Structures are given as C-alpha cells and as structure tokens.
Amino acid sequence: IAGASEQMRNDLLLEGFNNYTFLSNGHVPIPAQQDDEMFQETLEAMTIMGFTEEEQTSILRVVSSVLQLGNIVFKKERNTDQASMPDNTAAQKVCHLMGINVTDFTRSILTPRIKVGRDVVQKAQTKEQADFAIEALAKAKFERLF
Amino acid sequence: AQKPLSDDEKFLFVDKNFVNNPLAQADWSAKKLVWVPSEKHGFEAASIKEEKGDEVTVELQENGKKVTLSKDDIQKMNPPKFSKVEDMAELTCLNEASVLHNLRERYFSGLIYTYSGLFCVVINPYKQLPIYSEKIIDMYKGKKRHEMPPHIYAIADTAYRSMLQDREDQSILCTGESGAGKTENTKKVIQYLAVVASSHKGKQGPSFSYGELEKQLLQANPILEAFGNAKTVKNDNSSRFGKFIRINFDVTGYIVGANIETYLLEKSRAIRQAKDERTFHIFYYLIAGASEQMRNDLLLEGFNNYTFLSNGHVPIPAQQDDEMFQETLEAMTIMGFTEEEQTSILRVVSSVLQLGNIVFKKERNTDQASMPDNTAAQKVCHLMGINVTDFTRSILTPRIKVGRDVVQKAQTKEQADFAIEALAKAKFERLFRWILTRVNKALDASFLGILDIAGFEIFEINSFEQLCINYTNEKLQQLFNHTMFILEQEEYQREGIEWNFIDFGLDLQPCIELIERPTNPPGVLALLDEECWFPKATDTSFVEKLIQEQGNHAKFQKSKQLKDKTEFCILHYAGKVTYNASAWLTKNMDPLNDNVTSLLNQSSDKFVADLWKDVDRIVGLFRTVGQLYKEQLTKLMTTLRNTNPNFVRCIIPNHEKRAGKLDAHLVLEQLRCNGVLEGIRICRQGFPNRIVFQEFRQRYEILAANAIPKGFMDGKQACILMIKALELDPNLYRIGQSKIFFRT
C-alpha cells in the first residue's frame, strides 16, 4: 500500500490505508523502520535471489487479494436469513488477483452445490455461514502463498 | 422483403414476407376496440360505445350486435404486428384473451414449438415434420439460443452447455396429456448426446461413427409389449408403462454414465379379468402354438382348464394367438437373453400363468393368506437372482426386529399377497425393471436427468394404473408452481430490488391434496394407504371414506349415481376423470418388505444387485405403493427440485387423433391446466436468471480495454463503467444487492 508505484498501484489494485477492514488498529506504525521504503528494499532483495521479472508482482498480488477479501460484508437480509453480499470490488479486486472463476466464487460463497452423503447437494448459505467461510478463504490464501 | 422461405422451413421460421397495409394503422381511430369473451373463439373483437359506470354498451365488430358489458370483461386490444410470434412474452398486452390468441393462427402455419418466457410450448402436429438429422444437430450445434429458432435441439444443447458453465446440474422433464408427444421428445435427446457429448477414436443424415458405449446405448423396446400388454375394453392391444434417464459426465464432460428408470404397470388383471376382457398376451399363445411334445414338457393344461383364463378362450379381432406365439418368442434375443433364459421365458409363460398363480389367494379361514405353488416361487426367485426359500419365508413371515421383539409374524393376504403381489408384479415390475437392469448394466462430475411421463389419460375403466398416470402429471405440476411462482417472488422481496408482489392463485396443491395429502382431511392415496392397511375396509368403504372426507371440495365429484360400481369423478388440473375402485385397496399397498429387498440388495446373480441398491425407503420399522410412488416420484421430484427443470411442455390440439385438428378451447383448458398464462405472467415481469456483478467485470475487460481507467471504486459502479461502455441497459440487468438478476 505504501511503496506502490502508480502503474502497479492501479494494477495490483491499491486503495489506501484503512480501506481494508482486516487490517485493524488502523495502520500501526513501527519504530525505526518505515514500511514505505521497506517495500522498495524487499523488491530489490527478490531480484538478488532471482525472483523473476513478473513473479515479484505475482507474490505481491496474492498478498493484495488477501488484503482485499474483507470488503465482503454480509448484511442480515432478514427474509430468508440466508443472506448475501452487496459490493463486488470486495470480490473483484480479490478475483482479478486470484483469476479463479468469478461467477463461481460467489456462487460457491453463497450457494454450495456441495455434498451430503456422496452426491451433489444445494443450499443457500445464511448471513452467518457466508461470512465465516469467506473469512477462512481470505486467510487460507496467504498460507497457501507462504 | 427477405429471401423466399422454404416450404419445409416455414415450419421453423415465421412467414414474415407479407404486405405493408395502411389499414392496420388507419383503423386505430376506433379507439374503444377491445377483446370480448366468446365460447367458440375464446375471445374476439368489439368496441366500447357508452360508459355505464362499470357497464359499457360494448358492440361487436364481428357480429355488430350491441352487448352491454362490464369494465372488467373488456380486455385490451394488441397491435397487429404480434401475429404468430417467436416468444409469447413479447405481447405488450398480456391478458388471457390474447395470450390464448398466439397459438391458433401459429400451429396451422407449421410453427409448433414457441418460447413462452421461461418455459416453451410444444403443440402436437400429428404430421411427420422433417426437423431432424445431423443437418439439425450441426445447424443447432453448440448454439447460443438466438441463432437457432424455437425447436428442441436448443433445449438439448442448453442442458449440455449450461452444466459446464453455470454448472447447475441440469434436467429435462416433458409434460402434457396423452398423445401430446413426450416419449419421442426424450429419445431424440439420446440421439443428440451420442454424437455431441461423447468421445471418439479419432474424428450426416443418420451417419456418423459414434463410440462403443454409445452404440450399445439404444436397443431396448419390443419384448414387454407381449409380456405386459393385455386385452381391455378400450383397446385390445394397449401398452401400460413409462420412463426416465440420468447421464453422468467425467471431468471433461463426456458421456460416461446413463441411467434409465421406468415407473408403474397395469399389473393387476391376471387374477380378475372382466367379462369379455383378456389377459397378458402370451398365455393364449402357449396353449395355441402347442406342439404335443412340449404340451407335455412345458406343462400345459388345456383350453379353459385354468384357474383364471376367464371367459374361456375369448378370441381377438384381426390377430391369431396361434402365430403370434412365434413373433413374440423372437424379440427377446436382440438386446440379449440366452436359451437358458428362454427355456426360463418359456417357463415365464408358466411364470405369468403362475404370476396369475403366485398370488396368496385370500385365505377364507385364517385371513392371512399363503403361497399356492412352490414351483412358481422356484421359477421366480432364481429368475430374480436371490433364493426361493428365503423369499417365501419372508413373503409370509417378515422376520423383522424392533427392540427385543423380533417382529416375526404373518402378513395378511393384503399385506403378504401385497408384498407378493408387490412382488408378483414387482416381479412383473422390478422384472420389467430387470429389462431395465439389462440395459443400465452397460450404461453406467455432472449429470443430466430426463423424464418420459406416462401421459394423462381417460379410459372408461380407469383404475390405480391410471390413478398414478393422472397423479405423476399432477405431482409434476405442483413442482412447476412452487419453482416458478411462490419461491421466485419471495426472493424478489429479499434483494432490495424493486418488484411488488402478485399472487396468481396457482397452488394446484388442492387437487394434489385431494389425492396425496396424508394429514388434515386426507385425499385418495392417503385414505387408501390407511384403507390398504385395513380389515374393515372394502373398495366400497374406500369410496365411502372418500365421500366422507372430501365431498364438498371444489375439485372433487361423486359418481354418476354408481355407488354400486364405486367410482369417483375428479377435477385434476386438466379437468375431469372417473376412476373405478374395485380391487384398488391392494393396488395402493406395496409394503416394500425389507427382508426381501435386503436379499435382493445382497443378491448374487447377473440380474439383481444393481437395481435394488436403493435401500433407503425400505420398511425398517413404513411405505406402500401409493406412498412408494409418491417417494419414487420424490427421489425424482426432490432431486429434480435440486436440479434445473427444463420443461418440454407438450400440448394436445384434438382428442380425435387427427391431422390438422386444433380445438382452441381444449387448448385453453390445457392452458389453465398447465398454468400457462400465469407462467408467462411471472416470466414477463421479473428476471429468470440470478448471479452477482463479477461475471460482468472479468469475462469482458478484454472487450473494452479503456473502460476502467486509472483508479477503482465499488464493484457495481466500476462494472457499470464497462457496462455503459458496452451500452448494457438499466432494466436488462437488475444490479441488486448481491445479484444481478438477469432477464431472458
């Protein structure tokens, strides 16, 4: 978010500090290290290890889709109770750095065409069921990344 | 002004090449032009002359007769441009008068199938319209709907396409009364996939090389027509059976699994033929083509010297049982029965003569009835791949087990000669379904389900066989309603999207209750499940309990005084029928004995282990035929609920079997019955599809590289950028809370 150059600031899809809900305590500063330049540094360090000409921006994207997932807010639509999701950049900026299927991310995240027994079972998810699962997805992508 | 349209292809494309007349634009001066009620035309054309509060002296512009009529009778006149249209939902004026009108002038031009918003209307022509071959595969192949006019191969691709796209598991269900056209709009789909969805060892009219599994795929029908059809009062040779398919697909989408199911049979007459009726084809044939030697060997008692070849030998018009012996001996060979199997199907004459004899003849003294013949059971269970002793044991004594109590007891005649008529004729049924096993065996992420309904009928002597026929119809019909009225608009409240609620009065559940509703005041089936489990209960007291419980219901009707025959006339969605109740009680019972079902579940031989692994429903404490067939139709109906109901809604023009003959009021009856005008009235209004806004942003950024420039905002508004940069219309989509509701 800090050492973004204007091209990949709009490519790797950067809004400013606190436009991510999953970054709490706002932006806490660190003593005697300034995240701003520390970005630029680590990018060099990549090129020294031999992280590829494109690959550097790819690691940075996976990160930023994780940064992104927490705009996916579920409001209690209270006439199923099985409530769904208003914004799309919440998922969009996530799934352009994912490139999974855009249709099917949310259509999974709302209707699990899942499995009870050993066959295909449909259900709409509740507000509650939808939040918790997407949350797991947000974090789990950073683990897969590491 | 376009090209000349082919004589044939007029039956695909509308005759557009007509005349630029000024009359259709001058005539509007008569500004009180209206559609008015008519028994013969359905509606017609008139004009208001004088406003009497809620009356108006309306005047016909056909007959010229002044008819004072009310503000509410008079229905809005449509513009001439809408004649014979491709989608019915396009008619600016929706109102019954004119939603009726689109079909009449259409079918007579050739134009059978027509889109009606969500569902598509498919009338019967009774004429060999040439609309099939690989011309019509590859014309329509892989095809986005707008490039191919309203005809079947569009539903068929849309199944295979969508499944790999939206990835709903897709299904196909064909509806509408008898003759209508359903059987055949099922088989044509098997032709489609065998070429299109399959795979190929490398790689016109009828010709192409399909693969191996795909070749086996076809060769089933001709046998069951003898060993199953029997001489009635209405038809000396009528069939009585009806079917289904599932089509499992791999990772890449190819045909891998395929699963055919048939539903129920006129399984009853063998041990009760009415005066001047006959039994199942083959009996009469074995006595007739009886060479002396096998007259001794195959155990032939003679003409009339039979328990239940009633009315002696009744002959048959224009058929001679003699010779017919050989023809019906021939058919069994094709899809493949051996000569062990056929000396056995020779003793399947002895087994349909003795499935006129595996019936626990009501035991007058004890009441719980028992097995007349060992040899008959011996014929039977070996030819059902289980064991003969283990069968009959259970078929008298269910050796079940609740708590401590090994619920060991006798079954009654009704209970035992039901689980052994429910297995003399689930011999005749799960052995019809053994022909179905002998197919599926070579036949079995995604799947396609398809359903050939036995089609709504009226015999004179209708009976449980027909109770079910005009039940499947009715049961599928409340599926349609719940999917397409109620649940829809519930979600319309939900999303925050502008749409106000309309009710349609299309819960047809009241006729379906009138048959199927277990609790509350029960209907036909429920009263008969209870009555099936009942000693004080006579087919008589079944109809007495039906008058008792239903009576005054605005969909029910008594017999034409024939309490003596004990029968009931009912309004089903497509009007009225008489059923007759003699020997119905048993025909609702099938108490699927798990003792047998489990020996069948764990059966050894090439016959059974496959078709009884459906162990779920079975009596672990439970079900009847009525119930079983509500449930078999629920294994269907509630997984259908959780699939996409592509409906192929077949419509009858006449009851006179004729070429040409339409009746617009018979059709208008079947429109109210099929729930058409209101199925169109929802799907004109809302938005059939429903998905979120990301299906916008990704798949098309490529389409308009400039659209989102430096900087980004909300997903809705950002997609709205490329949306307006591709002109996407503010009511084509409905960018809701979650979902873009998408129209047709």
Q: What's the CA gap between B511 and B523, in Å, rounded?
A: 9
Q: What is the DSSP letter of B89?
A: G
User: Would an 8 Å CB–CB cutoff place A102 in contact with chain B?
Assistant: yes
Residues whose CB is less than 8 angstroms from the CB of residue B363 and which lie 6 or more positions away in sequence, other chains included: B369, B370, B413
Q: Confirm whether residue B183 is marked as ligand binding.
A: yes
Query: B197: helix, coil or strand?
Result: coil
φ, ψ for residue B114, nearest 5 deg: -145, 135
Q: What are phi and psi of B51, to 5 degrees?
A: -70, 95
Which position has the token pair 């009359």?
Answer: B23
Question: Under an 8 A CB cutoff, do A110 and B714 touch?
Answer: no
What DSSP element (H or E) covers B66? strand B66-70
d(CA A98, CA A102): 9
- Give the DSSP per-residue string, B346-403: HTTTHHHHTTTTSS----TTTSS---S-HHHHHHHHHTTTS-HHHHHHHHHS-B--SS
Strand B243-249 relative to strand B740-742, pairing:
unpaired
Nearest 5°: phi and psi at B33?
-60, 130
Contacts of A105 in chain B (CB under 8 A): 694
- Residue at token pair 């420039």: B709
Which residue type sits at B413? K
Could you tell me the two tokens for B29? 């001066």
Decide if B712 and A122 are in contact by the 8 Å CB cutoff: no
Tokens representing B79? 């513009």
Facing B712 at nearest CB: one of A89, A102, A105: A89
Using CB atoms, pick whichever of A15, A75, A105 lies closest to residue B694: A105
Check: CB of residue B54 under 8 Å from CB of residue B72.
Answer: yes
* Amino acid identity for residue B31 in this structure: K
Radius of gyration from C-alpha coordinates of chain A: 18
CA distance A88 to chain B (A): 4
Could you tell me if A42 lies within 8 Å of chain B, comparing CB atoms?
no
Gap between the Cα atoms of A100 and A95, Å rounded: 6
CA nearest neighbour of B125 among B184, B64, B39, B50: B184
Structure tokens at B210: 């399909």
What distance in Å separates the CA atoms of residue B377 and residue B118, rounded to the nearest whole number?
A: 52
Report the chain A residue with the minimal C-alpha distance to residue B495.
A77
CA atoms of B85 and B113, how far apart (whole Å): 11
Consult the annotation and say whether B176 binds a ligand. Answer: yes
Q: Encoding tokens for residue B644?
A: 């996409």
Phi, psi dihedrals of residue B172, rounded to the nearest 5°? -140, 125
The neighbouring-strand residues paired with B174 are B452, B648
Do B669 and B654 form a contact (C-beta atoms < 8 A)? Answer: no
CA-nearest residue to B492 within chain A is A79
Tally Cβ neighbours within 10 Å of residue B2: 7
Closest by CA to B122, choosing from B138, B106, B137, is B106
In this complex, is the C-beta atom of A36 within 8 Å of any C-beta atom belonging to chain B? no
Residue B470 class from Cβ within 10 Å (0-12 exposed, 13-18 middle, 19+ buried)? Answer: buried
Query: B162 and B155 in contact (C-beta within 8 Å)?
Result: no
- b vs e for B191-212, b when ≥16 Cβ sit within 10 Å of the residue's Cβ? bbbbbbbbeeeeeeeeeeebbe
Q: Is A36 exposed, middle or buried (0-12, 13-18, 19+ CB in 10 A)?
A: exposed
Looking at beta carbons, which residues of chain A come within 8 Å of B711? 10
Contacts of A86 in chain B (CB under 8 A): 737-738
Tokens of B720: 């709205």
Mutate to test the interface with B, among A101, A102, A111, A115 (most CBs of B within 10 A): A102
A96 to chain B, any CB pair closer than 8 A? The answer is: yes
3-state secondary structure A57-107: HHHHHHHHHHHHHHHCCCCCCCCCCCCCCCCCHHHHHHHHHHCCCHHHHHH
Q: Please judge whether B718 and A89 are an interchain contact, meaning their C-beta atoms are less than 8 angstroms apart.
A: yes
Distance from CA of B565 to the nearest CA of A (A): 48
Count the Cβ atoms, other than its own, within 10 Å of residue A81.
Answer: 11
CB atoms within 10 A of CB B174: 25
- Contact assessment for residue B715 and residue A85, using Cβ atoms and an 8 Å cutoff: no
Residues of A in contact with B695 (CB under 8 A): 102-103
**What is the distance between the alpha carbons of residues B291 and B51, in angstroms, rounded to a whole number?**
87
CA-CA-CA-CA dihedral for B195, B198, B200, B205, to nearest 10: 0
CB contact under 8 A, A92 and B715: yes
Is A95 in CB contact (< 8 Å) with chain B? Answer: yes
**Element housing B25 (H / E):** helix B23-26
Q: Which residues of B are catalytic?
A: 178-179, 183, 235, 238-239, 455, 457
Q: Rounded to an integer, what distance in angstroms lies between the CA atom of residue B403 and that of residue B696? A: 60
Nearest one of B457, B436, B438 to B228, comparing CA atoms: B436
Give the chain B residue nearest A84 (alpha carbons). Answer: B738
Q: Which of B12, B14, B13, B28 is nearest to B80 (CA)?
A: B28
Take residue A66 and report the two structure tokens written for it.
Answer: 């994780």
User: Mind telling me how many Å the CA of A137 is from chain B's nearest CA?
Assistant: 17
Q: Say yes or no for a CB contact (<8 Å) between A91 and B166.
A: no
Q: What angle do CA B52, B94, B686 make, to 5 degrees?
A: 130
d(CA B670, CA B103): 13
A100 touches chain B (CB under 8 A): no
CA atoms within 13 A on the CB side of B390: 15
**Which helix (H) or strand (E) element contains residue B154?**
helix B153-163
Interface test with A, best of B616, B692, B742 (most A CBs within 10 A): B692
CA distance linking residue B31 with residue A131, whole number of Å: 58
B119-123, strands of its sheet edge to edge: B113-116, B119-123, B644-651, B170-175, B449-452, B243-249, B255-260
Distance of residue A91 Cα from the nearest chain B Cα, in angstroms: 8
> How many whole angstroms separate alpha carbon A102 and alpha carbon B700?
12
- Chain B residues close to A77, C-beta within 8 Å: 494-495, 737
Whose tokens are 């229905």? That residue is: B75
Pick from B614, B608, B601: nearest CA to B385: B608
From CA B281, how far away is CA B582, in angstroms rounded?
Answer: 23
Task: List CB contacts (< 8 A) between B169 and chain A.
Answer: 113, 120
The Cα B135–Cα B417 span in angstroms is 54
Tell me the one-letter amino acid at B705: A
* Alpha carbons B124 and B656: distance in angstroms, whole number: 12
Residues 6+ apart with CB under 8 A from B342: B329, B332
Q: A113 — contact with chain B (CB < 8 Å)? A: yes
Contacts of residue A91 in chain B, CB cutoff 8 Å?
692, 694, 715
- What does the angle CA B442 – CA B447 – CA B448 come to, to the nearest 5 degrees? 90
Residues of chain B with a CB closer than 8 angstroms to some CB in chain A? 166-169, 447, 490-491, 493-495, 642, 691-695, 697-699, 710-716, 718-719, 737-739
Of A10, A75, A88, the CB nearest to B710: A10
The reply, when asked if residue B177 is annotated as ligand binding, is yes
Closest by Cβ to B713, choosing from A79, A89, A122: A89
Q: Residues B413, B419, B421, CA angle at the centre, nearest 5°? A: 75
Separation CA A61–CA A146 (nearest Å): 13
B153 and B142 Cβ atoms separated by less than 8 Å? no
Using a CB-CB cut-off of 8 Å, the residues of chain A touching B733 are none
DSSP reduced 3-state for B104: helix
Q: How far apart are CA B419 and CA B411, in angstroms?
A: 9
Instruction: Count the helix, strand and coil residues of chain A and give each as a percent rounded to the nearest 5.
Output: 50, 5, 45
CA B81, B87, B90, B96: dihedral to nearest 10 degrees?
A: 90
d(CA B185, CA B206): 17
Beta pairing class for B75-76 and B33-38? antiparallel
> How far is residue B599's CA from residue B380's CA, in Å, rounded to a whole number?
14
